[PDB]
Amino acid sequence: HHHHKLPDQQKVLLVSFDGFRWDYLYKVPTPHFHYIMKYGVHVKQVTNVFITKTYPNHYTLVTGLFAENHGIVANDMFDPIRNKSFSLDHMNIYDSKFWEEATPIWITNQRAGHTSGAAMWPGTDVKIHKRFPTHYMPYNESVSFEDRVAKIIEWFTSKEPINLGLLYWEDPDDMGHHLGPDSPLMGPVISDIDKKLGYLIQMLKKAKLWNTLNLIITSDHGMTQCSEERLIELDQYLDKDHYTLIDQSPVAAILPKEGKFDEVYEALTHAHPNLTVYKKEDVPERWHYKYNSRIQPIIAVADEGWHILQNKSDDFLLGNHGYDNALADMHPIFLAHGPAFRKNFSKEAMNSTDLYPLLCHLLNITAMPHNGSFWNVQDLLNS
């Protein structure tokens, strides 16, 4: 019995460091990451969704749905029913119908009477189902990490405070791309992320939120090494005028021209021993990447570490991702600290579709139908 009602702090701050492979924690000393491990929960490897790209996987975290179901199937995709294109190269991401096949968690959260704050998380500056996060930032990669943390802290400590915060950062994906995960120069990059994590922990303690807030550190995918010796040249096997390349590598989404499907499909099946070609209808079920109109007729998947380009002279990056989600190189991290989470606990694996049911349970809101299970991840909690 208490004379004041005890505060129920169903609060979550969800942080994503883009492209943080599961084993980056061990490439260099990561005291702040191990600090959370010591007083929180830690999953050695997360199984994310296929394709293992940024936007498909971030949306899975806020919907609990496979890519075929929530509709963000790739960073580049073409809608044949609407004759519309979605691309990141020029931030052509604001066509709400591309996002509206599912409901992100911040909408469900706000429909339940709460408020949400977003700091550059993919899709939070897009109008979905006519709505935005209660607070959000227009996407601008130049905005420093410290400025993004400032808005999150502000919104958590305001007169009307948010109960859900989304924080996003472009590293170490960017550096992992240009350097390659094998580069020794990644050490300074990873250590910087650990520094940035520590800065976030300091600001949270300074703001008196540290013991009242469930902090979750995760990522969308990992990274794998590419090579000039592991290239696959479409011009060697195909006439560029016979198809349209909707998405390139390592999962090529090919839309053959009128009547050229059989010619294209035959050329690609016998093209290369490290390129596996599927008809849209033959895509392995375990990827859950087939039952959507934005899946192109042909899906050609390169093996791990192999890169697809149209001309062998084209540019390519030493690190890349998007391969089969069963690969360990594509698996991100998962850390969490908070009043709801155990202390010094570790789990071998977790399915990334299980974050959504967990986030809703922590927030005491009702989840939309999803493809995860709260029961898979309930052993992360004190009750």
Ligand X SMILES: *[C@@H]1O[C@H](CO)[C@@H](O[C@@H]2O[C@H](CO)[C@@H](O)[C@H](O)[C@H]2NC(C)=O)[C@H](O)[C@H]1NC(C)=O
Tell me which of Zn ion, ligand NAG, ligand X, none is bound by residue 351, counting a contact when its beta carbon lies within the kind-specific cut-off of 5 to 8 angstroms. ligand NAG
Residue 173 annotated as binding site: yes
Does the annotation count 54 as an active-site position? yes
Q: Does the footprint of ligand X cover residue 371 (CB under 6 A)?
A: yes
Q: Does the footprint of ligand X cover residue 369 (CB under 6 A)?
A: yes
Q: Does the footprint of ligand X cover residue 80 (CB under 6 A)?
A: no
User: How many angstroms separate the CA atoms of 356 and 109, rounded?
Assistant: 12
User: How many angstroms separate the CA atoms of 245 and 247, rounded?
Assistant: 6
The residue count for the chain: 383
Q: Does the footprint of ligand X cover residue 288 (CB under 6 A)?
A: yes
Judged by beta carbon, residue 43 or residue 102, the one nearer ligand X is 102
Judged by beta carbon, residue 251 or residue 367, the one nearer ligand X is 367
Judged by beta carbon, residue 125 or residue 173, the one nearer Zn ion is 173
Q: Looking at 170, 174, 192, 233, which residue binds Zn ion (CB under 5 A)?
A: 174
Residue 147 annotated as binding site: no
Tell me which of Zn ion, ligand NAG, ligand X, none is bound by residue 143, counting a contact when its beta carbon lies within the kind-specific cut-off of 5 to 8 angstroms. ligand NAG
User: How many angstroms separate the CA atoms of 190 and 99, rounded?
Assistant: 32
Q: Does the footprint of ligand X cover residue 97 (CB under 6 A)?
A: no
Tell me which of Zn ion, ligand X, ligand NAG, none is bound by residue 376, counting a contact when its beta carbon lies within the kind-specific cut-off of 5 to 8 angstroms. ligand NAG
Residues of this chain, 337-356, that bind ligand NAG according to CB under 6 A: 349-351
Residue 18 annotated as binding site: yes
Residue 90 annotated as binding site: no
Cβ atoms of 236 and 247 closer than 8 Å: no
- Give helix 186-206 / helix 145-157 axis angle, nearest 10°: 20
Residue 54 annotated as binding site: yes
DSSP strand pairing (116-119 vs 164-169): parallel
Residue 124 annotated as binding site: no
Burial 280-294 (b: 16+ CB within 10 A, else e): beebeeebbbbebeb
277 exposed, middle or buried (CB, 10 Å; 0-12, 13-18, 19+)? buried
User: How many angstroms separate the CA atoms of 131 and 124, rounded?
Assistant: 10
Residues of this chain, 273-332, that bind ligand NAG according to CB under 6 A: 273-274, 303-305
Beta strands in the chain (DSSP E): 12-17, 41-47, 77-79, 84-86, 116-119, 164-169, 214-218, 224-225, 231-233, 243-247, 251-256, 275-279, 298-302, 307-309, 319-320, 334-337, 345-351
Residue type, 171: D
Q: Does the footprint of Zn ion cover residue 220 (CB under 5 A)?
A: yes
Q: Does the footprint of ligand X cover residue 108 (CB under 6 A)?
A: no
Contacts of 49 (CB under 8 A, 6+ apart): 56, 57, 60, 66, 67, 288, 325, 352, 353
**Residue from 30, 47, 52, 54 carrying the catalytic annotation:** 54
Least distance in angstroms from the C-beta of 87 to ligand NAG? 17
- Residues designated as active site: 54
Chain residues in the site for Zn ion (CB under 5 A): 18-19, 54, 173-174, 220
Which residues contribute to the annotated binding site? 18, 54, 173, 177, 220-221, 321
Interface residue list for ligand X (CB under 6 A): 65-66, 69, 288, 369, 371
| Known binding-site positions for Zn(2+) | 18, 54, 173, 177, 220-221, 321
